[PDB]
Amino acid sequence: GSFVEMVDNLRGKSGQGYYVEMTVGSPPQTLNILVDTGSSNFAVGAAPHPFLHRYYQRQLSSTYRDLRKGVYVPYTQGKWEGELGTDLVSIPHGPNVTVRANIAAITESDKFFINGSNWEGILGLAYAEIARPDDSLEPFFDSLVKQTHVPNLFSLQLCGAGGSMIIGGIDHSLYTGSLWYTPIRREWYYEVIIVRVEINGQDLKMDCKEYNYDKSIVDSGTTNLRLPKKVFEAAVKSIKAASSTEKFPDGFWLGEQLVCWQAGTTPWNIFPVISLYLMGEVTNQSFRITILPQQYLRPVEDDCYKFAISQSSTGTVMGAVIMEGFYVVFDRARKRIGFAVSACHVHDEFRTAAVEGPFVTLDMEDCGYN
Numbered sequence: 001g002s003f004v005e006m007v008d009n010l011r012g013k014s015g016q017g018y019y020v021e022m023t024v025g026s027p028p029q030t031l032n033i034l035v036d037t038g039s040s041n042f043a044v045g046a047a048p049h050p051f052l053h054r055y056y057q058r059q060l061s062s063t064y065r066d067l068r069k070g071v072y073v074p075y076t077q078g079k080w081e082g083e084l085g086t087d088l089v090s091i092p093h094g095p096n097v098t099v100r101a102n103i104a105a106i107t108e109s110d111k112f113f114i115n116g117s118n119w120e121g122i123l124g125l126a127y128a129e130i131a132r133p134d135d136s137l138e139p140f141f142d143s144l145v146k147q148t149h150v151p152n153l154f155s156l157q158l159c160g161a162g163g164s165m166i167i168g169g170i171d172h173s174l175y176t177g178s179l180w181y182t183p184i185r186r187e188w189y190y191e192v193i194i195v196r197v198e199i200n201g202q203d204l205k206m207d208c209k210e211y212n213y214d215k216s217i218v219d220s221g222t223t224n225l226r227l228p229k230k231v232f233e234a235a236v237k238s239i240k241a242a243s244s245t246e247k248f249p250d251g252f253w254l255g256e257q258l259v260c261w262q263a264g265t266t267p268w269n270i271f272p273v274i275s276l277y278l279m280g281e282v283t284n285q286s287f288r289i290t291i292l293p294q295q296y297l298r299p300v301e302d303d304c305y306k307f308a309i310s311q312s313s314t315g316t317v318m319g320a321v322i323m324e325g326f327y328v329v330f331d332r333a334r335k336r337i338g339f340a341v342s343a344c345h346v347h348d349e350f351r352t353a354a355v356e357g358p359f360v361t362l363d364m365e366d367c368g369y370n
């Protein structure tokens with residue numbers, strides 16, 4: 001399992017996602033595409049926009065095809081809108097293959113393209129269920145798999161402060177220890193089940209349904225770890241108490257105010273370690289993943305930091321803060337998500353992120369909410 005073409009094929013600014021090189025059309029038109037496992041449309045900019053600079057030019061592709069059908073994607077704090085079509089796609093530092101796929105050519109934007117982000121489009125890598133306009137618009141990865149011999153599998157190493165996407169394979173060099181897998185509960189988002197939460201080993205002692213209310217997803221297109229209101233409050237209460245030797249304003253905890261120490265003097269060790277126990281492959285087994293303050297304290301330009309754990313009303317989003325500690329294998333073929341300690345993860349001399357198991361956990365499928 002060696003994939004040296006694909007290693008280090010991701011780049012990205014802090015809090016502005018991780019993107020990848022893709023070409024579309026004939027002749028090839030290069031674009032930087034956000035890697036988003038929380039959506040299922042491959043959409044790209046196809047018109048002028050201030051924060052864009054390059055874009056898809058459909059009238060220059062001899063292989064473009066118009067599906068003569070619009071698509072409208074509203075969401076939490078914005079919208080994008082565009083015209084459906086198809087065209088040959090490739091990934092220069094990906095599998096050596098060209099495939100025809102659904103492309104959404106974006107024409108209206110609103111709080112979507114981010115200034116100085118250097119990505120021009122989005123590659124939704126999750127399931128048809130949540131594709132727009134409807135689940136019959138085949139997402140790119142499916143197309144890729146069905147048109148080639150590429151296994152139904154991708155893995156993501158994301159490094160805090162670049163990273164790798166391996167399509168079709170697990171690269172052992174990107175991580176150490178063992179891979180541990182958790183079931184994909186249902187195939188829309190990469191939904192999975194959390195059965196226990198610990199701050200420095202203290203249980204939140206919470207009815208585990210609260211952890212997945214009304215779902216727990218793995219989303220590379222979300223920066224923060226987002227937790228359900230109820231879980232969030234208890235988590236911050238516990239993190240507060242554990243780092244209480246130094247105190248911060250309410251505003252820091254709400255993800256607003258930065259906090260700064262002199263360069264190189266960051267007291268990582270006063271902040272607690274956060275562990276999520278995920279449902280295992282075998283009955284009555286969980287494994288845990290364990291992330292550091294280095295993961296949930298996001299650097300900003302003294303060394304300055306922004307708290308990267310926020311409230312949610314739509315359930316647990318396991319974002320980049322979580323993904324940055326782990327090689328995360330997206331094993332669609334066997335319906336499961338594999339975690340291993342990332343070889344590229346940020347940590348101090350004294351504490352590392354971790355992936356340990358097994359643990360005896362009874363009644364784990366009570367931990368999902370319906």
Ligand SMILES: Nc1nc2ccccc2nc1N1CCCC1
Nearest residue numbers: 036037038039075076219221222
């Ligand atoms: N993963 C997400 N992708 C998006 C793409 C476009 C617009 C909004 C998006 N929101 C996402 N999140 C997953 C659940 C809520 C946030």
